[PDB]
């Protein structure tokens, strides 16, 4: 697939607002993911013992993971589809070391959309949500193709 320049502008306009508070958005996204799909917490050996949302909000390690994820995804989105070099190392660690199935990438995509809709309603109307969903679908299609080349395709 291919996004138009106008679709990319809608994605990067709301992403510029996310970048005013990377750690806060990272925390909100991972807490939404763990509350909605609790099985995903099991992939994190450092904080898989957390039992409540209060514990998750106080976790320094969870906050650091949110910042690493959003910094990497922000770099991929700022390439506007020319992200082959960025995806290679991410695909290799997620297929071979962490073993993250494509369905968990779909789950965190839903969590990003929910958080952006809650925090940025004025910059995340229907057209902007549609563009963000297309950008995340492109990212998941390209990572799934790299998973297959690497021997995982999960
Ligand atoms: C937007 C999608 C995602 C991006 C851009 C992303 C990016 C990253 C980055 C940059 C790292 C550190 C470098 C590395 O190990 O490759 C990382 C580590 C990790 N990610 Fe992902 N990630 C994403 C989704 C997920 C999801 C959905 C899960 C699990 C449900 C996950 C599980 C992990 C784990 C377990 C680690 C290692 C954590 C540690 O160091 O303790 N990732 N991710």
UniProtKB/Swiss-Prot annotation:
Location in the cell: Cytoplasm, Sarcoplasm
Binding site for nitrite: 65
Highest taxon listed in the record's lineage: Eukaryota
Cellular component per GO, a single term: extracellular exosome
Annotated binding of heme b, by residue: 94
GO BP, sorted A to Z: removal of superoxide radicals
Catalytic activity: Fe(III)-heme b-[protein] + nitric oxide + H2O = Fe(II)-heme b-[protein] + nitrite + 2 H(+); H2O2 + AH2 = A + 2 H2O
Enzyme Commission identifier(s): 1.7.-.-, 1.11.1.-
Residue ranges of every copy of the Globin domain listed in the record: 2-148
Name of protein: Myoglobin
Organismal lineage: Eukaryota, Metazoa, Chordata, Craniata, Vertebrata
Gene: MB
